[PDB]
Nucleic acid binder design. Structure first.
Ligand SMILES: N[C@@H](Cc1c[nH]c2ccccc12)C(=O)O
Ligand SMILES: N[C@@H](Cc1c[nH]c2ccccc12)C(=O)O
Length: 794
RNA sequence: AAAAAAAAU
């Protein structure tokens, strides 16, 4: 549990294809970079203020300290120069005025750019050197723009509603590769809060055309409170505050302790205070106040604006993200041009600071040779046992039937849509069309539903389900019908998955009224596996050597709340196909990325594997999603030990080979076809299966990019896979082929997906757990015994 | 919730 293995070899499988990546080569001098520390006092100022301080400090002290040198600054403590200041070592104390800060500057170290060069060729990486470069490259944009993490944004106009807005910008990061340093540049866009009076913000949040009223009900108040809680407001009557809460009382009645001349404190209303103190009679005294700072300062809504440049963290409404998707989605050729325009306007080679440090960035995207891997054949069952060949990451189930399809003889219908809109004719039409398709799918639904009724309310689910379970023996499935978003789906699943242990397939009302063969076919895919059926398997002989001996495939992922706990989910294969997965899920610490109870979860799965296959896996392949590079050493430490602990806990001399692989979908590397002949679809993306493990990947470690999916919309994100550990000593080809084939085992669609099925299943499990969430939390997530032997999360 | 992809005082 320590050091990632070196890259074993380079992949050679698949046909070559010319690509270009949004990585721009950096010509970097072999000099030393000089590193100074900065103690600014006070030391809690926002990074922007620190940058203003440093900026003025440099100019004000030109004659005696900085001269013609252009230093760069990281926003906090670290300042760099391309030439050593006349400091030598001894600390100096300074003053700066916007009002008055005390800055001390003290030489710490020499960042060797030569040490970086040799790390790039081999021997064998100074992180602080990479960081020094990053500080240099983003010094200028950090002042001209609004940095968010590693990106930069500005306002243009592009409303999303609810007080939210779209800001366009770009990601920027310096990355090591073999022989070279790379500048990663990609276009980006995120949600920002519109800068406007809080009054208007209230209208957009509560759907008012005009504010012109009467006190908010308890409902309107908590909606608005949730929206503005934690946001920054400024006063119209230049002061900034933090909104910590919205008062229950209106301004005319909300009071606070006010100390008079005698020293005695009395309660005074916010309305009365703003009248005496500011000659201001409140326009809307019936509206509540923003409680700011910390506990008794209150602000009326009409004297506050939402501070500009506030990024939106909270979950977007389904309509908000939609227009965001639409306004941000661009084809691969389109995105490539925007990056070119960005390089041209960023104009790095004329930036004063990178010129100062003698850095040169190339304005041509890096040429990369990729390899398009051959997809696995998909074996089906039924009469003819047809073999499907994915073309452009897609196949279908025409003239084909399930590997093992479940014959349905007993099933029920629970319509929670009103008979008014979902008529008896609809149900009968839906039922008839569903059965025809299912027949063809190799999952024959014989007999009309044993039961079919209507209902309303989440409170009606269990007694209705208690009913069905007790009276209909052999009951396999309850198809539930819902009208749009509604909290009964969560209730249907909670009762179905955790309490009674019954397979339930929810379906929208609209997909019942108007049925299509493709929709029904996709509905049958989920139904079959939820009854323990097997839709299809990888062509057995079209499999890598890893399947020679008992192996279990794990998919782990932790999802964080939109306070509320995080949810860790780990799934594991239960056969040799591999097809069926058992799920383990835990609630854990809010925003804790590491799976705390991993050892226990892995053990459970290992047992389940042994009871299903009567074999102990000789290898454990672990696909870990949702981990940033800055957390590798930490996650690799506890988690590799955790799964190794599970094996020891099982049996003393049980030591299966573990391959620890992190899967990353959240990065900003893009791959584009050099030949226009290689573009696929209207989106013009790279084909399903192109693999990159050269030039732009890690100089020493085992990592590769694999775009396993076909780009339908926008620009494809090629999934990144970084091997943190590998007892099994995989070759580059066999691993890359393995994860690619695993992307063809996702049962919800006849498509190759962007990440391997176990990783995708892990996501679904943790997210199903969210709906299960309506010490007792750990129980509202614990799932019935009979459902476990099914992929209920499918 | 048929489904993948896509922004993310
Ligand atoms: N029972 C399996 C044995 C086996 C071989 N390789 C495996 C990999 C995983 C699980 C089981 C296996 C056959 O069929
Ligand atoms: N305890 C398991 C047997 C077992 C020992 N070591 C294992 C490793 C993996 C799976 C099962 C086992 C049964 O019950």
């Amino acid at each position: 549990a320590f050091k990632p293995p070196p890259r074993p070899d380079f992949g050679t499988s698949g046909r070559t294809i010319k690509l270009q990546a949004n990585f721009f080569e950096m010509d970097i001098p072999k000099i030393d970079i000089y590193h100074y520390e900065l103690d600014i006092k006070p030391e809690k100022c926002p990074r922007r203020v620190n940058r203003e301080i440093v900026e003025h400090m440099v100019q004000h002290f030109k004659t005696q300290i900085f001269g013609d040198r252009k230093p760069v600054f990281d926003g906090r403590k670290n300042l760099y120069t391309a030439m050593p200041l006349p400091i030598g070592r001894d600390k100096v104390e300074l003053e700066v005025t916007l009002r008055i800060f005390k800055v001390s500057i003290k030489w710490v170290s020499c960042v060797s750019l030569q040490a970086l060069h040799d790390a790039l060729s081999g021997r064998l990486v100074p992180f602080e050197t990479i960081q020094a470069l990053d500080v240099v490259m983003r010094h200028l944009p950090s002042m001209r723009y609004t940095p968010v993490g590693r990106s930069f944004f500005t306002a243009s106009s592009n409303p999303l509603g609810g007080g939210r807005e779209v800001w366009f910008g770009f990601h920027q990061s310096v990355r090591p590769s073999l022989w070279k340093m790379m500048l990663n540049i990609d276009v980006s866009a995120t949600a920002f809060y519109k800068a406007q009076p809080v009054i208007e913000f209230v209208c957009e949040v509560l759907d008012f055309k005009s504010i012109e009223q009467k006190p908010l009900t308890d409902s309107q108040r908590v909606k608005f409170t949730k929206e503005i809680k934690g946001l920054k407001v400024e006063i119209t009557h230049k002061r900034k505050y933090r909104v910590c809460n919205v008062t229950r009382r209106p301004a005319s009645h909300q009071t606070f302790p006010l100390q008079q001349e005698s020293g005695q404190t009395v309660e005074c209303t916010v309305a009365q205070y703003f009248k005496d103190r500011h000659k201001l009679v409140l326009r809307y005294p019936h509206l509540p106040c923003l409680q700011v700072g910390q506990e008794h300062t209150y602000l009326p809504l009409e004297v506050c604006n939402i501070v500009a440049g506030q990024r939106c963290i909270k979950k977007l409404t389904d309509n908000q993200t939609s227009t965001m998707i639409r306004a941000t989605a661009r084809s691969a050729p389109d995105r490539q041009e925007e990056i070119s325009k960005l390089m041209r306007s960023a104009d790095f080679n004329t930036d004063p600071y990178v010129r100062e440090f003698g850095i040169m960035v190339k304005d041509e995207m890096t040429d990369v040779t990729g390899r398009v891997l051959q997809p696995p054949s998909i074996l089906y069952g039924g009469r003819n046992k047809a073999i499907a060949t994915p073309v452009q990451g897609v196949w279908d189930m025409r003239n084909k039937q399930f590997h093992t399809g479940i014959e349905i003889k007993v099933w029920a219908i629970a319509c929670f849509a009103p008979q008014r809109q979902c008529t008896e004719v609809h149900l009968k039409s839906f039922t008839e069309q569903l059965r025809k398709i299912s027949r063809d799918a190799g999952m024959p639904i014989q007999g009309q539903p044993c039961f079919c009724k209507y209902a309303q309310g989440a409170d009606s689910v269990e007694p209705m389900f208690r009913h069905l379970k007790n009276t209909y023996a052999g009951l396999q499935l309850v198809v539930v019908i819902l009208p749009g978003k509604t909290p009964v789906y969560a209730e249907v699943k909670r009762v179905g998955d955790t309490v009674l242990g019954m397979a339930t397939q929810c379906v929208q009302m609209k997909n019942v009224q108007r049925t299509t063969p493709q929709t029904l076919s996709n509905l049958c895919l989920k139904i079959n596996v939820k009854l323990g059926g097997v839709n299809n398997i990888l062509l057995p002989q079209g499999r890598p050597p890893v399947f020679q001996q008992p192996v279990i495939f794990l998919g782990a992922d932790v999802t964080h709340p939109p306070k509320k706990p995080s949810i860790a989910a780990v799934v594991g294969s239960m056969d040799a196909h591999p097809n069926r997965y058992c799920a383990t899920v835990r609630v854990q610490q809010h925003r804790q990325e590491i799976i705390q109870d991993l050892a226990a979860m892995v053990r459970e799965l290992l047992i389940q594997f042994y009871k299903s296959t009567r074999f102990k896996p000789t290898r454990i392949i672990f696909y870990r999603d949702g981990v940033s590079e800055g957390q590798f050493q930490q996650v690799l430490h506890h988690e590799l030990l955790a799964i190794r602990e599970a094996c020891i806990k099982l049996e003393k001399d049980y030591q299966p080979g573990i391959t620890f692989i992190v899967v990353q979908k959240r990065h900003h590397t893009r791959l584009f076809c050099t030949d226009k002949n290689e573009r696929v679809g209207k989106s013009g993306n790279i084909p399903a299966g192109t693999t990159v493990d050269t030039k732009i990947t890690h100089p020493t470690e085992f990592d590769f990019y694999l775009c396993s999916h076909a780009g339908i919309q926008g620009t494809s994100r090629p999934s990144h896979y970084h091997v943190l550990w590998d007892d099994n000593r995989f070759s580059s080809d066999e691993l890359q082929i393995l994860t690619y084939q695993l992307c063809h085992t996702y049962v919800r669609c006849t498509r190759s997906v962007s990440i391997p099925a176990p990783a995708y299943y892990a996501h679904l499990v943790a997210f199903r757990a969210r709906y299960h969430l309506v010490q007792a939390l750990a129980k509202a997530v614990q799932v019935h015994q009979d459902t476990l032997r099914t992929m209920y999360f499918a």
